[model samples]
Target: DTKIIYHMDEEETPDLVKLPVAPERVTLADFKNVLSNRPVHAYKFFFKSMDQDFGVVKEEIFDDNAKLPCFNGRVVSWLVLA
Candidate 1:
């Protein structure tokens, strides 16, 4: 599995939002299909970072601006990959 990390800034806050189901548990074919059939504009990922020595643990794909949430730099940030 590939791991992506998001570095949080000092002034950001974590935003609570609906997240996508775990992709790792899905079959490779299903995962491939999801990736291939995903909305073209839905390529961006959304995430929130937790404090501590631990790195990023959760993330999601955001398809619309309305689904996006505002966050504070002190508590939240995101990372994504293709």
Candidate 2:
């Protein structure tokens, strides 16, 4: 098992990425789909991860104008050297 950390503000002390669902495309609607009460911030989500069954947990930090159709960054990735 593995996990990703979304540094709230480059210095938020704690992280924000608590969810662990792989998405083929990162959408604000689905990304925000959390059970937590804290405000889920998105964007620059620390680009933060790797693996086979992985995906964008949250990256809503980008403004709508600058936002990509999906999470542009690879939150999870790996090279299968076999």
Candidate 3:
């Protein structure tokens, strides 16, 4: 399973969302469709620095063909924009 922590706005605390991570290739755009009921943007994917730092980093995954990343069966995060 893959987890998403999302905030509706920057000032708000995030909420947790759970999703199944597919073994087959799936783009972030495909995941976006499954997530929202209304038209919205879940465009940014953020996670802790994988290499070394304790800091968080982000990816602009707005494209329809954007590649989905596996979180090594761990946690990840995103932002929701309406």
Candidate 1 displacement at residue 77 in angstroms: 2.4
Clashing residue pairs in candidate 3 (N, C-alpha, C atoms within 3 angstroms): none
Cα deviation of 46, candidate 3, in Å = 5.3
Descending-TM-score candidate ranking: 3, 2, 1
What lDDT score goes with residue 74 in model 3? 45
RMSD of 3: 4.1
lDDT of each: 0.35, 0.35, 0.54
State the lDDT of candidate 2 residue by residue for 24-78, as single tens digits: 4444344445424644442233233332366634222334223223233333211
TM-score, every prediction? 0.25, 0.31, 0.51
**Clashing pairs in model 2, backbone N/Cα/C closer than 3 A:** 42-60, 42-61, 43-59, 43-60, 43-61, 50-77
Model 3 lDDT tens row, 1-82: 5565555555567676665655235556555766677355534554422444543455445576755544555445565553
Per-residue lDDT tens digits for candidate 1, residues 1-82, read 3222233232275333222433233222222233443443433455553435775444464433222222333223343344
Off by over 4 Å in 2: 1-4, 10-21, 40-82
Model 1 — which ten-residue stretch has the worst lDDT? 66-75
